[PDB]
Design a protein around this ligand. Structure first.
Ligand code: HEM
Ligand SMILES: CC/C=C\C[C@H](O)/C=C/C=C\CCCCCCCC(=O)O
Ligand SMILES: CCCCCCCC
Length: 466
């Protein structure tokens, strides 16, 4: 059996310990090296560390970090960890940002509204099923048209600053049968959502500014919710007016129209659009780096399969696209779009890692940095390599139990009883549709890459048409 080890690490002095750790995290090391350097110092993938934001935003920055794929899954076990008000970590954004409600993402499964609200989203997703393919194909076709246009003008085409509009338009049309162009939102939604998301997440992000500016401006106190209330109201009225069919189901589930609307707004703008804002540019980055031979192989598979399917893209056709499925899973393994999962121990726990076990007391905040679980070399071979074909075949597919992007194993299903992403199957579907739309159109592409507060900044520098 595993030896019991004392959890190494410490929190430094009051005030200055957490500040120095925050500087390492944001500025002097960056998140990955912040965690890896301490794995090396402590010779442990489980240790005590301060997490941002601390300061006057979070009451208590002290966590136990789980940084391997054996210990990490404790964070999924709702009998071991409480998942209340910790969606964003050791602080929670003001409910003033969300209509006065504690939104689904912050609710522990022990709360009755968790079941009701998650069921509402499951319905939203199921009811959209026959709109997803045609609306994705129409909206993303327009995006690539615009990218070709921009490339012809500038010699490069900024992906993110067009793809954010495309994502919102797609979601509005697929979920609500509503084109934002036909509404008072016009083309404003991305800007509105970006500002509102910033008011929620600024304690966790760097914008690029020098630390002397950023630290007092976004890392010490919460930005005032009052400043984004009118923008939020524009979004709220769009959802109230557009989500009629879904609101009928909300009524049947016993959810108030107001609560349902705030939750639909959040699920659409924050969970879905925000998650896509991170995922899609990251996918372009990793697939771009994979090189033209991989591009050509994806193009060959995708086009051949669609031809075999009489030109009709369907769920069943996608199941034949083995390399495509595997590439999407590898993007999610290599670069989890959301790196930070938290859980508060409900009771005393014994947490097993690879070489030792650790005891934590009820009330301790557990934290996992997902990339270190999903690139754990004791679980995955070639762990730090992007391997397009990793999940192809019976043996490859077994490894999906260790892909954790959704806050649970990829082999598991989100339920009203767990805190796994309500949109798990939707995300994997639209990520596949994204790769499919790229390679039905292009043989290969080249990219330029930069940093972004969320995800990656990506430009196309070449789009080689079929
Ligand atoms: C690429 C896009 C997405 C990404 C990267 C993503 C990622 C995640 C992650 C990591 C969590 C766990 C949060 C935690 O730490 O507790 C989560 C939860 C959640 N996500 Fe997703 N998500 C995406 C899309 C969606 C979609 C399409 C929906 C629509 C239903 C959705 C709804 C939710 C909800 C409601 C939760 C909380 C679940 C609960 O309370 O049981 N997300 N998501
Ligand atoms: C813009 C919101 C990003 C994703 C939405 C998704 O449904 C899950 C969110 C999960 C937790 C909320 C905090 C997101 C921080 C994302 C950037 C920092 C990190 O990757 O840890
Ligand atoms: C980076 C913080 C800026 C806050 C924006 C306020 C807009 C009125």
């Amino acid at each position: 059996d595993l030896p019991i080890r004392n959890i190494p690490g410490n929190y430094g002095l009051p005030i200055v310990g957490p500040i120095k750790d925050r500087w390492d995290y944001f500025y002097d090391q960056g998140a990955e090296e912040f965690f890896k350097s301490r794995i090396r110092k402590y010779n442990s993938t489980v240790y005590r560390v301060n997490m941002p934001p601390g300061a006057f935003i979070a009451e208590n920055p002290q966590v136990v970090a789980l940084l391997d794929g054996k210990s990490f899954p404790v964070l999924f076990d709702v009998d071991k960890v409480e998942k209340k008000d910790l969606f964003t970590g050791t602080y929670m954004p003001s409910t003033e940002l969300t209509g006065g409600y504690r939104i689904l993402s912050y609710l522990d499964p022990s709360e009755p509204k968790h079941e009701k609200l998650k069921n509402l989203l499951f319905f939203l997703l199921k009811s959209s099923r026959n709109r997803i393919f045609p609306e994705f194909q129409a909206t993303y076709s327009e995006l690539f048209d615009s990218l070709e246009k921009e490339l012809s003008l500038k010699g490069k085409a900024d992906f993110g600053g067009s793809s954010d509009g495309t994502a919102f338009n797609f979601l509005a049309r697929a979920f609500y049968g509503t084109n934002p162009a036909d509404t008072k939102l016009k083309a404003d939604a991305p800007g509105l959502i970006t500002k509102w998301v910033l008011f929620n997440l600024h304690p966790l992000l760097s914008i690029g500014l020098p630390r002397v500016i950023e630290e007092p401006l976004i890392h010490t106190f919460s930005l005032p919710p009052a400043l984004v209330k009118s923008d939020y109201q524009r979004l709220y009225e769009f959802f109230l007016e557009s989500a009629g069919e879904i609101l009928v189901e909300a009524d049947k589930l016993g959810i108030s129209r107001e609560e349902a609307t705030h939750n639909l707004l959040f699920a659409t703008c924050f969970n879905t659009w925000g998650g896509m804002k991170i995922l899609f540019p990251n996918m372009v980055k990793r697939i771009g780096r994979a090189g033209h031979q991989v591009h050509n192989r994806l193009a060959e598979e995708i086009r051949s399969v669609i031809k075999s399917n009489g030109g009709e893209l369907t769920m069943g056709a996608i199941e034949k696209m083995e390399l495509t499925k595997s590439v999407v899973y590898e993007c999610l393994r290599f670069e989890p779009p959301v790196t930070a999962q938290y859980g508060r121990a409900k009771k005393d726990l014994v947490i097993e890692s690879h070489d030792a076990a650790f005891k934590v007391k009820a009330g301790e905040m557990l934290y996992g940095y997902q990339p270190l679980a999903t690139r754990d070399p004791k679980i995955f071979d070639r762990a730090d390599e992007f391997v397009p074909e990793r999940f192809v075949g019976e043996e490859g597919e077994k490894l999906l139990r260790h892909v954790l992007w959704s806050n649970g194993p990829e082999t598991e299903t989100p339920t009203v009883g767990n805190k796994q992403c309500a949109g798990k199957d939707f995300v994997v579907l639209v990520a596949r549709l994204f790769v499919i739309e790229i390679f039905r159109r292009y043989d290969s592409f080249d990219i330029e890459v930069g940093t972004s507060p969320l995800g990656s900044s990506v430009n196309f520098s070449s789009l080689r048409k079929a």
